[PDB]
Amino acid sequence: LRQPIVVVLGHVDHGKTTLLDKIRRTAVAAKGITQHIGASIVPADVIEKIAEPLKKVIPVKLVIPGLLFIDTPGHELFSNLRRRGSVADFAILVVDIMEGFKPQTYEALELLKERRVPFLIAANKIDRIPGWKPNPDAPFIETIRRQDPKVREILEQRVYEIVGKMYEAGLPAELFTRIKDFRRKIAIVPVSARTGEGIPELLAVLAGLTQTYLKERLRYAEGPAKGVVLEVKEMQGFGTVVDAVIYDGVLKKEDIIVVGGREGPIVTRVRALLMPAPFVQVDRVYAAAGVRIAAPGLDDVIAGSPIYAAESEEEARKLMEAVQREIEELR
């Protein structure tokens, strides 16, 4: 298996950026992350370490190698993960527990539905519930046991409101500690992206659900890379480069690639693969990775475009019609 690819959605100011940064900080402290372009990997060992206080209540053993978190949240990035469903394997829908569902919360729901991306809800800012007294970094189930009873009562009223919106939207959901069948109900996991409370359940649910239910998508197949472009930018000493996510196979230096551009399909060859310095050049990257790709002729590449490596010029040519067809469905 390779790493699930996780995207973070939700309304402005509900804590997406904060949550991703808390996760990364928690992982860096456990050991910590792997450095990818536009993404961070939490290794399975680190997830097992962070989930250690839950070991007696739930099985915490991982058969995924890690989780890859896309570091840019929100709807434009999610649109750039679409492919003939999504490249994303799982999403976190961040809702500020005090505020509830806002307009971009419902947009994210529609996008998730349309692309059939499975998800959970992170009911964030629980530290802002009147009376909350933090236990930093603790599992939700440990810290809530130490809050005033009125605190639990407010939390359950806010969660019930979320559950009401979700049902109205066609999607059964519940507090994660009130679910028997995680295939049938969307889990609501209360967290604080400020204090870290609930991050352990957060990570254990993501890991649990992806490795249990998505093993067919997560199968690594040795083969030429398949990916998506997330950004197009100018890079001094390399011209226009693309930041991509590789979701299957292996991408190597000097591989031929086919990518979509504004004046038609681009056929080029990898000149350098760049990763963050611990930029450094690497000879190859395996799925799942975020990598920066320097190749000639990428000026007109369309963000969101598929990227397909090719063993030969003749197989490249055969890919160009698929790429154009993909690009058309994405406009």
Partner: peptide, 11 residues
């Protein structure tokens, strides 16, 4: 429950 996460049920 094949995930085993319903070990949390009741908390």
């Amino acid at each position: 429950d094949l995930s085993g996460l319903s070990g949390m049920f009741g908390f």
